[PDB]
Ligand binder design. Structure first.
Ligand code: HC4
Length: 125
């Protein structure tokens, strides 16, 4: 495993060193999106939670194609405001329910260290 704790204050510095292989070693779901919501990275733990095959979702739009239940002011809305502002750091509970058994999760979104990428971290609650 990669020892990083969900919600950690410096998580963005830590995850900057990890490759797709490394990211698959996290205790939680990790997704990296560009400013337009396209999926740059998607780790194994997210695949375990949502049932999606990580390889198949990279390159797709998260809010439009892959995860339309997140297309709402309460999820996508916070994302777009953070991208516009160039600053994002929010944590909230949410229910994933698209093509899958409803699953309650904790979501943490944070701007990355590179200029126009953004993390979505997810774990069960
Ligand atoms: C809402 O969109 C439900 C499902 C979902 C599937 C995959 C990922 O990564 C997040 C959310």
């Amino acid at each position: 495993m990669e020892h990083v704790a969900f919600g950690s204050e410096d998580i963005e510095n830590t995850l900057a060193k990890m490759d797709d292989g490394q990211l698959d070693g996290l205790a939680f779901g990790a997704i990296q999106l560009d400013g337009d919501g396209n999926i740059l990275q998607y780790n194994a733990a997210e695949g375990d939670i949502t049932g999606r095959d990580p390889k198949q979702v990279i390159g797709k739009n998260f809010f439009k194609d892959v995860a339309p239940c997140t297309d709402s002011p309460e999820f996508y809305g916070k994302f777009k405001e953070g991208v516009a502002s160039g600053n994002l750091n929010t944590m909230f509970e949410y229910t994933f329910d698209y093509q899958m058994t409803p699953t309650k999760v904790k979501v943490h979104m944070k701007k990355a260290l590179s200029g126009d990428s953004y993390w979505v971290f997810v774990k069960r609650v």
